[PDB]
Design a protein around this ligand. Structure first.
Ligand SMILES: Nc1nc2c(ncn2[C@@H]2O[C@H](COP(=O)(O)CP(=O)(O)OP(=O)(O)O)[C@@H](O)[C@H]2O)c(=O)[nH]1
Ligand SMILES: [Mg+2]
Ligand SMILES: [Zn+2]
Ligand SMILES: [Zn+2]
Ligand SMILES: [Zn+2]
Lengths: 43, 57, 107, 1456, 49, 287
RNA sequence: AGACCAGGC
């Protein structure tokens, strides 16, 4: 699907620590899969 | 052409195109054409107005 | 009046208002090749006397500053040599009326 | 409004002053101090924005007057701004006086004798002494003793000139402030402020002051003094500054110069003698509005506080932070700097909040709107709630058409008859019918909904039974028990009866006949308005879903104006041209062709049925109380009548007796050849009221001049012609419902011979597209369509836009001459069914509905589908469409469609016809919005100009536009039959009754105006062979000496010279002198009445026909003339009269000597040659052959050498040096003769970097010159340079003239049109051009060289032929006033905000646009206005000074 | 200076007006294929040479 | 989805009920189709508004609208300056940015300077219009940028200038944040492993822009439907869904940015901290 | 009382 190709196109985004050269820890956060469900209610 | 559009052969096969069916005269079948494609070819509106060696569709 | 060829020195344009009450007017020699009052689109301009200025401001009960205005520096006021505050009778041809006298004052 | 509640006091004037801080501490109810609007539990907190001292808020009594919500007016409060801040309305003028002033002696930086020169010229302009201010200026490093002697004599001249002019009856001690002294005062203050701002040193004490800087608003900076000229401030023995210090400077500057600034800030003499202060420009106190005017909006629970409470809270939030920043300074570097750097930031934020409260566009931080932006545009306050308002007592509904209504009535529904109501006070003559109305109740027409008691009380009848309601019917006419209300009586708000008046209205109200006053007639059934068909063309109203307004007037002053003045029967003729707008339209015109035919014969039962079906004596249409008939046309075998004889006795019953019948000889739209051979049915003939010949048509009844309804309007009156349109509207409706009228498929067929004529002409169109293509391509003839040279140049035509225009205009010229051959042949001669039976032709020829081009496209062929000038557009490939091959020369392939709407158009013909149909639907959209703002700019200037009782039209403030309306003061709606002398002679005894000459002698002077009209007629026949400059006239016309509304025989000179030209020729018991005595009475009654809103009429007569719409043309031309008054005209021209001596060969070799010749126009090609490694260039410019350009441009070989020598290279040397500056970031020998080696040596000497030069001296074909550069420079293109220089170099040019064309002689005279304006240079050509006949197009250039009255004559003709191109007739009385209003100051002023600044009415300028720019200029001038303009008497609620309110009414009471 | 410079006999039913269209398919080396299409019967065929 | 017209009546809908639309708050909304420029075609464009980019700007220019495989677009307009040089124009956020194209011709692949010449000039070396305009283009790069000789040095300059605006990370070198410029901006319908094809397509676009200023080409009409394309509305619903999860993936970093600037209790390997900080962001993308 | 959308003449 095109949304998974859009998930892949955004890619990974990082942010480092202030805790002690190296910057800290990477946190290479991303999305890798998106899926839409048919509508379900809970009654 | 003299001072016309920039020449070249442009092939398109992607999403979101505009497409209409047209009947192709050698080996009479269906052909699907686009607006960028239609501006240089000679379709006819009825088969009683076909002129020889100029009309493709 | 004073007719010159090409230009006047800007140090010499200070002398044309330098005498009261006698005024000095100034004209090009190339602006006088055609008299503009002979043109078809202009009417017969006639300046009015001090008595005829009173009889116009009395019939219409006008102030001096409520008439239509003519500038002092258009080439018809320069032709007639108008000092400020005097009325010019304008004999105007029209399409359905013909002759009718209009008026302008030069401020 | 209640007519039983008078008012004795009236507002006379207003004046704009600055509201001082001392007043608004005494004005104030309670100062509000905390930025919390309302606290918990829904109460308003005391001390906040919502407060009970500021007004009653939300079911709670006030704390100032103690009243509730409905009765508290709201009260003024304020806040205390702790620092003086900048008022944004005055900051642009505060920054002028903060600059331009010394900071050391605190004068301005001018010398004190020149500041005094403006102090006493502005004093002379406060009074009416516009001329004495220039004599004052004729009074004349320098010691300061004679300067006091200079200031003395200038001050004594003013005190003598003010004393003389106030003694000699001229100027009041309140001064005189006309419009042209507002010009001389605005010109003098703008000159004074411009000269203040440009001063280096203070000319009183000579040392510098630091210049101030304003980047944007909210802040002021001063800059540090330079490092050089600090020496001047040592021989006299950046920084943000505070608004208290800016005020501290200008509290000293305005005191040291009090004697001057009193006249800058006053248009009129200051009789209060108040000081002008710097506190005017600052505001130390904000005024909060009353809390009534800032109540919050509410949508269920969604309640939001008002935008002003959001803006006044942020000022109060900053006004407490700035006091809490003063806590540490009250206790007292690091403890001092952080508390001061945060205090200075509070100074800027309290300024940015006092700006954003007043002006939202002066804010920063989608923004919250301020108090300026509640006033400015459409959706403002002047334009949304003052000039236009929502009204009570008014309905709107869809209209449906209706016969059987008497052409001045409207048909109202029952449910509009119930709701709309009228206050009738009970009297002795009402309690018969107004007691019956109050018994009927709110829901029984005719009834009543309320009774208003004497006390002002009001009793509703809605929730009441009939037993309770009959008791109130016996309460109406009772004597009042209150002495204080003893002269008042009860008002019963009855329903709308059949005798009331109604003002109908359809948008857009493009002219005044789109808002008329109709009578009423209620109708029983449905919920829609009912409009008669004679009104459908005045409102431009069709019946495909139109809805239109219905305003019900509420007093007797308004009922007497929409029955007598704004009446629909008074609006027969429109004042645009004098042509009728009212008449029968579609079925009635198709029925009078059948009724007035020769075939129509009626028996005795039929003939008398059609008369009573239209006359009906009991409703009051007859004038005899018995229907008279005629003897029949035929007596044997049985009696038959004729449809001529129908309308003879229809007109015999609606006419007044003892007044002879109508006499008319007119024609109609149907020719004689449609009725056969020997027919006379084209001319109509009325003789003593009897139709004797001719069909009746659109030209007779219908909106058309000089028909029978237009002639019944003149001889008998407007009440007769409005009654004839009713009776004929019922005579033809009753004729149609017994003898009908259809168009079918039968009506559209040609014959088998006519279809053969059609196809044989269209076979000649198969070669038309090729002959037109072969002509434009400059092949000769008979070349085939597949010729490769034909296809090559057609591809060259397509790539250019102008070459494709002369191909689309030659083919369209040829194929429209094939269209004109089928319409000439196949209709009517080839049609199967013919006239009168051919109903498609019968209603196109009669003007009922349709055209001859409409039946062409139906029955013959549809034609060339023309786009915006051109033919159908072509693709990039040379194909017009995918069906057609590229570049084929077929007429069908380019938009000429041969198929007709009867038999169909082909799919490629269908697609071309859809391109032209979409073109019409966009021009119907985009070109009805451009003429809407033409009329708004026109009506705002011309709202107040009107006929005075001097018959001398003038503006509302008193300034005079013209001395007589049109030069003759006759009304356009009364001058139609004024020069129709053959009509008025045939109807002499019937026109003598309506003017009644014997009863109208006592109030006249018949004797005196006739004598002076013979002294001038004899003088002008004797003189006036000479031209106009020789005529010392010695005698004015009788209009300029005698009042034409009182003196009989005081007529215009065209009326006298056309009556004495008519009555001389033909000699026809009326003699010669009784006809000239009745036309002069017809002239005098056809004078224009004083009070006519002429400039509205003159601006509606231009804006409404503008919706009907090689030089600029149309509504873009009217914007250039009227709206912008552009001196930068788009395409100026100049018409040059060729003499009779010079022939056509001496005139077109003459226009080759004026039209410019570029150097680009003579060059074939330019071949540069660059060899580098000193950068060299070989500029070789190749020309055409000398026999080719010396014939085409009359350029000699030697003159082309001088352009390269003295003009081309001096522009080329500049362009090379300009680019090197901006980048720092076969032929002959060389030993030719001694002169060419020195011709070369002079080119090298006087130029910068030339090393060689040679022109083709023996043939004039080439010019080669070497052009070296330095080796340091990088690469220049040197062809794009040369081409741009070759297009700017001129071989020969008369300045400001680029082309001179010799067109075909239009209308006899020989014409030579140029494409640019230079009058000085065309005066040298006396031998070719009549210099005393040079007219033009540039209205601003004829004003500069020929004067004011010549530009006034130029502007009339240019606004004439923009309407004469579309065959639109708008009369020269509306064009005269727009001319004399635009040149009223001796200049060429526009109808915009830049041309209306010289005007006395402040609310007129504020209502138009830029409201708070004219607002500041009024309050700075302290401008009092007399409330004269119509835009200024609606803001304050006065009766107008135009028309009905142009006088007062006084009541003669018998006892002293 | 720019402008002064100056039948098939279809065997199925018999028809001479027969709609044809030449079209060079693969390269300029081979002959142009003439695609024939009739109207009186509608039979189609092509022609190399 | 695959219901028969019998089963669409049993589920209350309608028999021949065509879908197409969104039910939002009981109201049947639908996203309209928009006609827009064709993908992946450089069309020669004359506009009077191209002159208002500053001084020396011509009315000439070329413009491509490259779409990505997730159907998201990016225009790359080339301008022609009257000085002789050309200019690459793009837009990453709601402001525009201007780059000379020789900076991009030397950043896509390892080029010579005759191979920049040979990609525009074919066998028509004798065409002295093109050779003079290509003198000014290649010498203007050496004049204005006397450094930046090889591909790895041009690409660090292009990454140094577009680092704070493309929201780069401190880990990325200037060599590889310059490739982050080239992968999201210039001719984005080739993607990664297509820098050879991006090179040849730029040499196509400069020569077509020089063929437009020479008069050899008609400007391609953007208002004719020959050069038009349809935004379907369903793809634009997916274009906006890329952004709202592009923004969602940034709010979970803008929340731990707020945690760095304030707090200390941060452990990136803690699942307890992941669920702690992921509940502090706005996850309601469907609203 | 605004925004946007759909219309009417
Ligand atoms: N001021 C405006 N008036 C309009 C507008 N639309 C319609 N109208 C008025 O309504 C009338 C509608 O006329 P049409 O636009 O339909 C022109 P049409 O060719 O349909 O005339 P007929 O064929 O005679 O009906 C027309 O007289 C206009 O005065 C509008 O957008 N603005
Ligand atoms: Mg309508
Ligand atoms: Zn109160
Ligand atoms: Zn000083
Ligand atoms: Zn056959």
């Amino acid at each position: 699907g095109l949304l998974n190709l859009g998930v892949k196109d955004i890619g990974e985004k990082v942010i480092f620590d202030g805790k002690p050269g190296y910057l800290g820890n990477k946190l290479s956060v991303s999305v890798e899969q998106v899926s839409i469900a048919k509508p379900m209610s809970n009654d | 052409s003299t001072r016309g559009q920039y020449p070249g052969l442009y092939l398109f096969g992607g999403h979101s195109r505009m497409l209409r069916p047209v009947r192709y005269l050698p080996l009479d079948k269906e052909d699907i054409v686009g607006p960028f494609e239609q501006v240089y070819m000679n379709i006819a509106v009825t088969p009683q107005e076909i002129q020889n060696n100029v009309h493709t569709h | 009046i004073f007719v010159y060829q090409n230009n006047i020195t800007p140090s010499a344009m200070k002398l044309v208002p330098s005498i009261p009450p006698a005024t000095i007017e100034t004209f090009n020699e190339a602006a006088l090749v055609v008299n503009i009052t002979h043109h078809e689109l202009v009417p017969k301009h006639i300046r009015l006397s001090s008595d005829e200025k009173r009889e116009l401001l009395k019939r219409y009960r006008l102030k001096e500053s409520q008439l239509p205005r003519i500038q002092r520096a258009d080439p018809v006021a320069l032709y007639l040599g108008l000092k400020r505050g005097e009325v010019v009778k304008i004999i105007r041809k029209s399409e359905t009326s013909g002759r009718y006298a209009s008026y302008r004052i030069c401020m | 409004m209640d007519i039983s509640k008078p008012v004795g006091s009236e507002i006379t004037s207003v004046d704009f002053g600055i509201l001082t801080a001392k007043e608004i501490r005494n004005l104030s109810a309670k100062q509000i101090t905390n930025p919390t609007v309302l606290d918990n539990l829904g109460h308003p907190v005391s001390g906040g924005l919502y407060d009970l001292a500021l007004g009653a808020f939300l079911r709670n009594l006030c704390s100032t007057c103690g009243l509730d919500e409905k009765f508290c007016p709201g009260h003024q409060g304020h806040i205390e701004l702790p620092v003086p801040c900048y008022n944004p309305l005055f900051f642009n003028q505060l920054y002028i006086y903060l600059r331009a002033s010394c900071l050391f002696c605190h004068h301005f930086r001018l010398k004190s004798v020149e500041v005094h020169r403006y102090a006493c010229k502005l004093r002379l302009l406060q009074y009416g002494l516009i001329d004495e201010s220039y004599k004052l200026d004729e009074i004349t490093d320098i010691s300061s003793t004679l300067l006091n002697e200079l200031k003395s004599k200038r001050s004594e001249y003013v005190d003598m000139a003010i004393a003389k002019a106030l003694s000699d009856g001229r100027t009041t001690e309140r001064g005189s402030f006309t419009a042209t002294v507002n010009d001389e005062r605005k010109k003098l203050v703008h000159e004074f402020h411009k000269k203040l701002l440009s001063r280096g040193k203070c000319d009183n004490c000579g040392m510098f002051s630091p210049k101030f800087r304003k980047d944007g608003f909210t802040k002021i900076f001063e800059t540090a003094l330079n490092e050089k000229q600090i020496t001047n401030n040592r021989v006299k023995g950046s920084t943000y500054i505070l608004s208290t210090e800016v005020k501290n400077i200008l509290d000293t500057v305005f005191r040291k110069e009090q004697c001057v600034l009193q006249y800058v800030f006053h248009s009129r003499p200051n009789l209060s003698r108040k000081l002008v202060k710097a506190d005017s420009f600052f505001m130390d106190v904000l005024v909060v509005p009353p809390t009534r005017f800032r109540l919050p909006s509410k949508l269920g629970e969604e309640v939001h506080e008002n935008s002003q409470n959001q803006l006044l809270s942020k000022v109060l939030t900053t006004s407490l932070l700035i006091r809490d920043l003063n806590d540490d300074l009250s206790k007292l570097l690091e403890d001092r700097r952080v508390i001061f750097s945060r205090l200075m930031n509070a100074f800027v934020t309290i300024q940015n909040d006092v700006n954003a409260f007043i002006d939202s566009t002066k804010a920063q931080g989608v923004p919250i709107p301020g108090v300026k932006q509640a006033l400015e545009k459409k959706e403002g306050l002047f334009r949304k709630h003052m000039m236009g308002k929502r009204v009570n007592y008014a309905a709107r509904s869809v209209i449906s058409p209706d016969p059987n209504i008497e052409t001045n009535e409207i048909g109202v529904p029952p449910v509009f008859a119930v709701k709309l109501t009228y206050p009738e006070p009970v009297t002795a003559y009402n309690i018969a019918e107004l007691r019956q109305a109050v018994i009927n109740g709110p829901d029984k027409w005719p009834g009543a909904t309320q009774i208003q008691n004497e006390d002002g009380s009001l009793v509703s009848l809605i929730g009441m039974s009939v037993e309770q309601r009959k008791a109130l019917a016996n309460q109406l006419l009772t004597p009042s028990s209150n002495v204080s209300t003893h002269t008042l009586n009860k008002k019963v708000y009855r329903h709308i009866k059949n005798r009331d008046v109604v003002l109908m209205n359809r948008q857009p109200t493009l002219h005044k006949a789109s808002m008329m006053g109709h009578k009423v007639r209620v109708l029983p059934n449905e919920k829609t308005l009912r409009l008669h068909y004679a009104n459908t063309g005045a409102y431009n109203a069709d019946f495909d879903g139109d809805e239109m307004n219905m305003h019900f007037p509420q007093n007797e002053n308004a009922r007497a104006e929409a029955l007598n003045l704004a009446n629909t029967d008074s609006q027969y003729l429109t004042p645009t041209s004098g042509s009728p707008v009212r008449g029968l339209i579609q079925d009635h015109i198709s029925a009078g062709v059948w009724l007035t035919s020769k075939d129509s014969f009626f028996t005795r039962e039929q003939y008398q049925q059609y008369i009573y079906g239209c006359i009906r004596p009991e409703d009051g249409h007859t004038t005899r109380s018995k229907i008279v008939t005629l003897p029949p046309t035929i007596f044997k075998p049985y009696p038959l009548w004729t449809g001529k004889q129908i309308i003879t006795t229809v007109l015999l019953n609606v006419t007044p007796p003892d007044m002879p019948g109508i006499n008319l000889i007119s024609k109609n739209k149907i020719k004689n050849e449609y009725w056969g051979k020997g027919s006379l049915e084209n001319e109509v003939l009325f003789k003593d009221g009897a139709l004797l010949c001719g069909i009746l048509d659109k030209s007779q009844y219908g909106a058309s001049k000089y028909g029978i309804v237009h002639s019944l309007h003149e001889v008998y009156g407007p009440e007769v012609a409005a009654k004839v349109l009713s009776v004929l509207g019922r005579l033809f409706t009753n004729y149609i419902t017994a003898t009908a009228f259809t168009c079918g498929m039968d009506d559209l067929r040609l014959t088998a011979e006519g279809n053969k004529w059609r196809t044989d002409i269209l076979k000649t169109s198969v070669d038309t597209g090729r002959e037109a293509a072969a002509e434009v391509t400059n092949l000769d003839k008979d070349t085939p369509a597949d010729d490769p040279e034909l296809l090559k140049r057609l591809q060259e035509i397509l790539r250019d836009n102008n070459k494709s225009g002369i191909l689309d205009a030659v083919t369209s010229s040829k194929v429209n001459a094939i269209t004109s051959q089928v319409v000439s042949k196949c209709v009517p001669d080839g049609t199967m069914k013919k006239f009168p039976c051919n109903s498609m032709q019968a209603m196109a020829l009669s003007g009922a509905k349709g055209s001859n081009v409409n039946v062409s496209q139906i029955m013959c062929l549809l034609g060339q589908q023309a786009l915006e000038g051109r033919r159908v557009p072509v693709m990039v490939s040379g194909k017009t469409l995918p069906s057609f091959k590229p570049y084929e020369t077929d007429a069908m392939a380019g938009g000429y469609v041969k198929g007709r709407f009867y038999s169909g158009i082909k799919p490629q013909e269908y697609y071309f016809h859809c391109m032209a149909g979409r073109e019409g639907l966009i021009d119907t959209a985009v070109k009805t919005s451009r003429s809407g703002y033409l009329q708004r700019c026109l009506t705002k200037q011309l709202e107040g100009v009107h006929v005075s009782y001097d018959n001398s039209i003038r503006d509302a403030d008193g300034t005079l536009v013209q001395f007589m309306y049109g030069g003759d003061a006759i009304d356009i709606t009364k001058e139609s039959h004024m020069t129709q002398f053959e009509f008025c002679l045939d109807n002499y005894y019937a026109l003598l009754k309506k003017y009644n000459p014997s009863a109208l002698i006592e109030h006249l002077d018949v004797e005196s105006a006739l004598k002076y009209s013979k002294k001038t007629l004899k003088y002008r026949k004797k003189h006036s062979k000479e031209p106009h400059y020789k005529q010392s006239v010695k005698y004015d016309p009788v209009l300029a000496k005698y009042n034409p509304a009182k003196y009989l025989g005081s007529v215009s000179e065209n009326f006298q010279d056309k009556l004495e030209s008519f009555l001389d020729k033909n000699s026809k018991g009326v003699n010669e002198k009784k006809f000239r005595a009745l036309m002069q009475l017809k002239y005098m009654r056809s004078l224009i009445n004083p009070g006519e809103a002429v400039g509205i009429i003159a601006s509606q007569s231009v804006g409404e026909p503008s919706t009907q719409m090689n030089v600029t043309l149309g509504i873009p031309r009217l914007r250039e003339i009227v709206m912008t008054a552009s001196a930068a005209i788009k395409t100026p021209q100049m018409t040059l009269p060729i003499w009779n001596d010079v022939s056509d060969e001496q005139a077109d070799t003459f226009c080759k000597s004026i039209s410019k010749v570029l150097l680009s126009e003579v060059i074939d090609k330019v071949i540069v040659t660059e060899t580098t490694g000193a950068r060299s260039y070989v500029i070789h410019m190749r020309f055409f052959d000398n026999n080719e350009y010396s014939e085409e441009y009359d350029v000699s070989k030697e003159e082309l050498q001088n352009v390269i020598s003295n003009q081309f290279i001096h522009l080329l040397e500049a362009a090379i040096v300009k680019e090197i500056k901006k980048q720092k970031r076969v032929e002959a020998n060389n030993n030719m003769n001694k002169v060419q080696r020195d011709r070369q040596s002079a080119i090298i000497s006087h130029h910068r970097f030339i090393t060689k030069y040679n022109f083709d001296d023996e043939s004039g074909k080439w010019c080669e010159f070497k052009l070296e550069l330095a080796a340091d420079t990088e690469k220049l293109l040197m062809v794009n340079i040369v081409e741009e220089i070759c297009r700017k170099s001129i071989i020969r040019q008369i300045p400001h003239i680029d082309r001179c064309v010799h067109p075909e002689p239009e209308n006899g005279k020989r014409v030579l049109v140029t494409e640019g304006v230079n009058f000085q240079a065309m005066w040298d050509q006396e031998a070719f051009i009549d210099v005393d006949g040079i007219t033009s197009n540039d209205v601003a250039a004829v004003l500069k060289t020929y004067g004011v009255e010549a530009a006034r004559n130029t502007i009339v003709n240019e606004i004439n032929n923009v309407f004469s191109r579309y065959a639109i007739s708008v009369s020269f009385r509306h064009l005269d006033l727009i001319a004399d209003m635009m040149t009223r100051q001796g200049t060429y002023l526009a109808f915009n905000r830049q041309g209306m600044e010289t005007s006395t009415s402040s609310f007129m300028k504020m209502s138009y646009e830029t409201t708070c720019q004219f607002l500041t200029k009024a309050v700075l001038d302290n401008e009092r206005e007399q409330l004269d303009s119509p835009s200024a008497r609606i803001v304050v609620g006065k009766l107008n000074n135009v028309g009905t309110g142009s006088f007062d009414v006084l009541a003669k009471v018998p006892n002293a | 200076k720019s402008v002064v410079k100056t039948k098939e006999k279809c065997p199925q039913c018999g028809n001479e007006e027969m709609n044809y269209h030449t079209l060079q398919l693969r390269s300029a080396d081979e002959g142009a294929t003439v695609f024939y299409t009739c109207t009186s019967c509608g039979y189609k065929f092509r022609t190399n040479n | 989805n695959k219901m028969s017209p019998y089963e669409l009546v049993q589920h209350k809908e309608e028999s021949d009920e065509i879908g197409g639309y969104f039910i939002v708050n009981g109201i049947e909304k639908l996203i309209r189709m928009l006609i827009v420029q064709r993908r992946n075609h450089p069309m020669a464009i004359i506009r009077p508004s191209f002159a208002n980019r500053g001084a020396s700007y011509s009315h000439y220019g070329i413009q491509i609208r490259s779409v990505r495989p997730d159907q998201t677009s990016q225009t790359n307009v080339l301008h022609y300056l009257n000085d002789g040089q050309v200019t690459f124009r793009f837009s990453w956020r709601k402001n525009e940015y201007l780059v000379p194209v020789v900076m991009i011709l030397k950043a896509l692949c390892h080029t010579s300077d005759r191979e920049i010449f040979d990609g525009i000039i074919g066998n028509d070396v004798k065409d002295s219009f093109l050779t003079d305009r290509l003198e000014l283009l290649l010498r203007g790069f050496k004049k204005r940028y006397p450094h930046l000789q090889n591909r790895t040095q041009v690409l660090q300059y292009l990454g140094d200038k577009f680092r704070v605006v493309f929201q780069a990370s401190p880990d990325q070198s200037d060599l590889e944040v310059g490739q982050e410029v080239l992968d999201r901006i210039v001719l984005v319908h080739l993607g990664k492993d297509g820098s050879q094809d991006k090179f040849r397509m730029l040499l196509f676009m400069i020569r077509k822009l020089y063929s437009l200023v020479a008069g050899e080409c008609s400007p391609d009409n953007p208002d004719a439907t020959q050069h038009q394309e349809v935004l379907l509305g369903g793809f634009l619903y997916g274009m906006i869904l890329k952004e709202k999860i592009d923004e969602y993936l940034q709010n979970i970093i803008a929340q731990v940015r707020m945690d760095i600037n304030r707090g200390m209790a941060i452990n990136f390997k803690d699942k307890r901290y992941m669920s702690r900080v992921l509940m502090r962001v706005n996850e309601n993308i469907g609203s």
